[PDB]
Design a protein around this ligand. Structure first.
Ligand SMILES: *P(=O)(O)OCC(C)(C)[C@@H](O)C(=O)NCCC(=O)NCCSC(=O)CCCCCCCCCCC
Ligand SMILES: *P(=O)(O)OCC(C)(C)[C@@H](O)C(=O)NCCC(=O)NCCSC(=O)CCCCCCCCCCC
Ligand code: FES
Ligand SMILES: [Fe+2]
Ligand SMILES: [Fe+2]
Lengths: 81, 74, 124, 103, 400, 400, 81, 124, 74
């Protein structure tokens, strides 16, 4: 299931980099990197499938929230300059 | 210079101190990087050089030389 | 609403009436203690001591309509003595009535008892 | 034209004070040694002339002004019989009125 | 497939314009409006002031007279309990009606337990109070009079302006529960001489969990605060003001002010359609409450010899409400229908239809057709209908 | 460009996972959860029960012990006032601390006016209560003890479990305001022997205007309801339950339960970075409160000889808070800092920094840099700094 | 005017017919039609321009709310069958 | 924060000090650290009756810093009698200070008067 | 039948009782319809017949004959 995990990871990162808000963008990139590093050595296929389903739900939420934050966006932060 | 920019991107992504990165060093064997590091390195290359790399060419990019060749060609 | 209550209303069983002038028919007509629930339950007896028909008409809530329908269904096929054993707890158990809904079951039991008393009084 | 009032210092001691019509309650207190402050000197900005008016005489007072009410709602320990002493003017209707100084 | 919604008196759907106004504060402008040292707080406070002005503009008031609450229940508690407790030393008597909402009625019952005296005014069979009875009920120690503007059960309108004139002549504070009236019938606090008004966001196509109370500042009505805390909202309601909710309430009030005349014309026509089409096809159907002083959006009909909750169960594709005691958690009969002199048998037969901003003619026609068919099916089932059709009077028959 | 947000103790941004869970009930599922005759009401009711189970799961309770409110202000009012008024006939005495939130303190003052006796416990210079004084302050007439879990101003943590053990030995109800602790440090109502607990939605990345109170059922704790009405929320809080808000609160609680450990280690790392980098650069900077019983997310520092509001105005690109009388509308000095024995000079000098679920190392570094440069500039402008550097003791100098 | 108004009317109708919710779709279509019928005989150019600006702002609101309602959609009504 | 106050802090004018031993320098020092506002207003007088230099150091909020800065700017160029004419009302009017911030204008005026009194007493 | 469907759509949109609609009756002059009426008729045609009508052709559609010709051609 290596290919499905590398593809979902790439989708989830390329999705999170399109967050309009700095706090949400930085959070989602950092959390996904940390979460997938945390589960690199998990052996049980049932647990690996449960994690892959939660990641899919997480990706759906990120898609909807990124779109909505594009619809209602504000100015960039002072750190972003 | 494409050479220096690509080497800088790889060094910043994988922490190779800008010295270990060569024209024949592999991402996984030579440098310390797993398949979660190389996905992000490829995406960083796509960010710096505006190019939607297909999955086939992304999995073809396994070495610094391969990334250099792809970026120079495209 | 519960599956059985919904089925008992959506699908009629013995909605109707029976001729009161007929000697072989006993009629009950009872009401709720603290709400507007009215049940009419009528049973019929053949030459021997067996109930061959029973009809109901109810003005009340869906649980009351279901209780009356189930009471008619359970009364049909029994004798007077076997019907006297029907209690509100059994009707409530079958319909899974919540605590606020036992007035319907107690009304159905009262209707059964009233119709059986009417049968005995008229057959005297 | 002489009107007699009663002041009630915080202790609860009653201080009978005699005054005339056309006077100010806050100043009448100051002359007769009642611990009423008049910090803003009746410019309607302090709430220190706060006083409780007796139940019977309360409606005989004129309705308060907008800034009097604006000061009262910030005044501490507000009650339904609260007015500001620097706005009550002695009148014949106020005979026997009792002014209590809030704690 | 989901059922149709005809229960607008219970709650309303959110207006998309209201949600559009709300979402920026749910995404980017999340600061505390009481934060005084930074821009998040500044922008939140400015949005809160804009909303306050919108509500005051809808009801014809000064923005300083508007206090945000968590709903009309909280607004009614603040009005009744705060006035009663503040004016306690001289005034120990309260006046309300027998047909008021339960938040008001329960506040009055708790004050009765607290040592106050409460008169509950009866209403006439039309649902309207007698002004002469109101004038007779006022005592020299009366503190407050509380009459709702639009009844949430039968939709009858009280003579608010006349009541306010009487209260001002007798020097008694006048509170009105306007949760069912705001944004639907014209309101002017100065023309009607209102002293306190309750407002609910989710009755006017705004968000749930927010409301407002109007408190007159000239002459100054004062209340004793119920929620202790940091002194927000002029000290009358402590706690953090929920900026997205108050922004939504302001947006809803602005939209209602713009839309009200069009909405009322449209709703009156649809209400007439529903009532006439039910009456032309069913006999022995009665409307509860007087049509002459009636809000058309709230329709209350009793279908004789049919039980209300059984009719509701039959109409599974239409979301409605009933006054039947069999729909209550505590088996409580309808006190409003008891108050307006309805027979209990017909009070167990009462159905409330709600027509609102988004209701459609197709929905109205569908509801009428379903109601006709199912009432016919249940009357064929009912013993009361059997006896009535068989030349028997219900009153004469013994019941056990 | 907008400033950085470093004020999580005032309020938090909405978590996108919380807004995602909320939106369906803001668009489609708009029914009233107390409507028990149709599907809109049924689905709203089901969502409300799901959220109740989520809150109970976070705090280790049974769902029947969770009551939704409009915030922790209302929760604190309900706990303190309702318990005191329910047990008034035998118990007329309450215990709290001097460093409590003002909703708790103001409820206690209003009860003190209504006839109760209230003891205000001092705290040590660390900001932690001493259990011997807590033991010695308890009367046979004692009703309630109210001690908060995490202080909102300095971030000290009280020994909640020990307090609960003492209260249960003395047979006294124990309430804790946990509005700064929920979802941030582990909580278990049964292990800490807690009887009542206040919860706030917008302190845990949930929506504003919603809260909850935990009320223990075994042994049963009873309260006198403050908001009168139709007996919703088991009769303890009447009014319509705001379904989108409670759904958001439950979603935030579930997210907090899933993210607590990860968040805590990251926030501890960031707080260490902030404190070390500031202390490493500026002399005469002091942390308020004990580091041994301290929540890392709330950092309170004093910058000697520089006024807090002046530093806050200098840091126009970072959102923060102070403890200055000058930063208050009432010109009220910080009573928490007064209670922990801070010099009045250094109380006007304190600044509160907040680190939360969305803080980045980049923002922490920017804040530290800007603070260092502006503290140096303000010190170069301070006469107190001039005197201190010029061999003068502040205490000996006469001041007018 | 005749061309811009007719273009804005067609855009508003097109956008409103894409509402996922029955109540919002029907209300938006009816409201747009009724408002344009009510203002057909206005002669003041300033009043006409103000109405056009209002309608443009409502078009923006409609676009955003249609999208968010497509992101969060539910089952159809019993009447739509 | 008001634009004038922000400008007064963001662009300092005469932050500093002056020699206390010099006979031609007056020194004002008013407010208390426990109160939270402290000002050090210093003026310099030439051979004739004219103020030629002024410095301030203020411990307090932005409004206090602006009040001291504006007081120093308005003090420079006047004589002792003309400097005595400055009241807190003018400073509050110029800075648009809300009523809660009236202490900053009062204390700037007090600093002016204290410095002038120090100058006169030490020139005696 | 394209003819009957187009005539039915026009009749339903403009209330012409299905009798007045002919092959030479204009939308505005013959039948009672303004421009607000037209934008709705053309949109109904686009809904029934799946076709993104350009503005240039839509402004050309002024008569029942023109609408029939456009629908039959496309
Ligand atoms: P590569 O060196 O070949 O290694 C890649 C992987 C990890 C695939 C390889 O090591 C492997 O096969 N490991 C075996 C088990 C495994 O793949 N585990 C990973 C499971 S997937 C996972 O961990 C999903 C995490 C969910 C993300 C949640 C974060 C979302 C945040 C939402 C807030 C906005
Ligand atoms: P046609 O015969 O050429 O005539 C068409 C027009 C209207 C262009 C023509 O009659 C004309 O020129 N009339 C002059 C005035 C005019 O053009 N009126 C139009 C003004 S713009 C207008 O009224 C827009 C109304 C705003 C719509 C708001 C809808 C709200 C929806 C909210 C949903 C949530
Ligand atoms: S004296 Fe200051 S307000 Fe009356
Ligand atoms: Fe029943
Ligand atoms: Fe100050």
């Amino acid at each position: 299931s290596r290919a499905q995990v590398l593809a979902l990871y790439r989708a989830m990162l390329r999705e999170s980099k399109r967050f309009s808000a700095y706090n949400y963008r930085t959070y989602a990139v950092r959390r996904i990197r940390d979460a997938f590093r945390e589960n690199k050595n998990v052996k049980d296929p049932v647990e690996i499938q449960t994690l892959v389903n939660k990641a899919k739900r997480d990706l759906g939420v990120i898609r909807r929230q990124v779109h909505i934050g594009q619809l209602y966006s504000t100015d960039k932060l002072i750190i972003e300059n | 210079t494409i050479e220096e920019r690509v080497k800088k991107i790889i060094g910043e992504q994988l922490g190779v101190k800008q010295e270990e990165v060569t024209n024949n060093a592999s991402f996984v064997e030579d440098l310390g990087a797993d398949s979660l590091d190389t996905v992000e390195l490829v995406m960083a290359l796509e960010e710096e050089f505006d190019t939607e790399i297909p999955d086939e060419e992304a999995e073809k990019i396994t070495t610094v030389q391969a990334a250099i060749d792809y970026i120079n060609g495209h | 609403y519960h599956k059985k209550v919904v089925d008992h209303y959506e699908n009629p069983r013995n909605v109707g009436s029976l001729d009161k002038t007929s000697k072989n028919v006993g009629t009950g007509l009872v009401g709720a203690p603290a709400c507007g629930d009215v049940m009419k339950l009528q049973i019929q007896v053949d030459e021997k001591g067996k109930i061959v028909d029973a009809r109901f008409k109810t003005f009340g809530c869906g649980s009351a309509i279901a209780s009356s329908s189930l009471a008619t269904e359970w009364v049909k096929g029994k004798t007077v003595e076997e019907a006297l054993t029907i209690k509100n707890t059994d009707i409530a158990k079958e319909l899974c009535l919540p605590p606020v809904k036992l007035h319907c079951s107690m009304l159905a039991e009262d209707a059964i008892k009233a119709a059986l008393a009417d049968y005995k009084l008229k057959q005297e | 034209d002489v009107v007699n009032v009663v002041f009630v210092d915080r202790s609860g001691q009653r201080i009978p004070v005699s005054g005339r019509v056309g006077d100010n309650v806050l100043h009448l207190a100051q002359r007769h040694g009642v611990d009423l402050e008049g910090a803003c000197e009746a410019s309607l900005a302090c709430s220190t002339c706060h006083v409780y008016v007796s139940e019977d005489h309360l409606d005989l007072l004129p309705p308060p002004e907008e800034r009097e009410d604006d000061m009262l709602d910030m005044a501490p320990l507000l009650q339904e019989n609260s007015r500001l002493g620097c706005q009550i003017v002695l009148t014949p209707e106020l005979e026997g009125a009792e002014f209590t100084l809030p704690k | 497939l989901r059922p149709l919604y005809m229960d607008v008196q219970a709650t309303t759907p959110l207006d998309p314009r209201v949600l559009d106004a709300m979402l920026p504060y749910l995404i980017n402008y999340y600061g505390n409006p009481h934060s005084r040292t930074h821009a998040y707080g500044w922008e939140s406070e400015a949005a809160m002031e804009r909303a306050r002005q919108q509500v005051a503009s809808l009801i014809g008031a000064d923005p300083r007279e508007i206090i945000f609450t968590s709903g009309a229940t909280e607004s009614n508690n603040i009005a009744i309990k705060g006035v009663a407790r503040f004016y306690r030393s001289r005034k120990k008597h309260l006046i309300t009606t027998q047909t008021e909402h339960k938040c008001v009625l329960d506040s009055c019952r708790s004050l009765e337990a607290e040592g106050f005296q409460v008169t509950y005014l009866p209403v006439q069979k039309s649902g309207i109070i007698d002004l002469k009875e109101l004038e007779a009920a006022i005592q020299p120690d009366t503190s407050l009079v509380s009459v709702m503007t639009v009844n949430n059960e039968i939709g009858v309108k009280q003579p608010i302006a006349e009541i306010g004139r009487i209260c001002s002549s007798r020097k008694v504070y006048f509170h009105t529960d306007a949760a069912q009236a705001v944004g639907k019938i014209p309101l002017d606090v100065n023309d009607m001489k209102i002293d306190l008004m309750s407002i609910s966001g989710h009755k006017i196509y705004g968000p749930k969990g927010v409301g407002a109370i109007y408190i007159r500042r000239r002459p100054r009505v004062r209340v004793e605060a119920l929620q202790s805390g940091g002194g927000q909202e002029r000290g009358m309601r402590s706690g953090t003001v929920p900026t997205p909710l108050v922004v939504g309430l302001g947006a809803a009030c602005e939209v209602a002010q713009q839309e009200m005349e069009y909405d009322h014309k449209r709703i009156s026509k649809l209400s007439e359609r529903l009532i006439q089409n039910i009456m032309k096809s069913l006999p022995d159907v009665v409307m509860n409450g007087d049509p002459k002083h009636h809000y058309p959006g709230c329709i209350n009909l009793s279908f004789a010899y049919v039980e209300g909750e059984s009719l509701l169960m039959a109409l599974k594709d239409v979301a409605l409400s009933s006054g039947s005691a069999c729909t209550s958690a505590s088996l409580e009969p309808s006190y409003v229908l008891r108050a307006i002199g309805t027979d209990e048998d017909l009070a167990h037969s009462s159905i409330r239809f709600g027509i609102g901003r988004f209701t459609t003619e197709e929905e109205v026609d569908y509801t009428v057709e379903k109601c006709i068919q199912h009432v016919k099916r249940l009357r064929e089932m009912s013993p009361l209908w059997e006896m009535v059709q068989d030349g028997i009077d219900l009153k004469s028959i013994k019941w056990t």
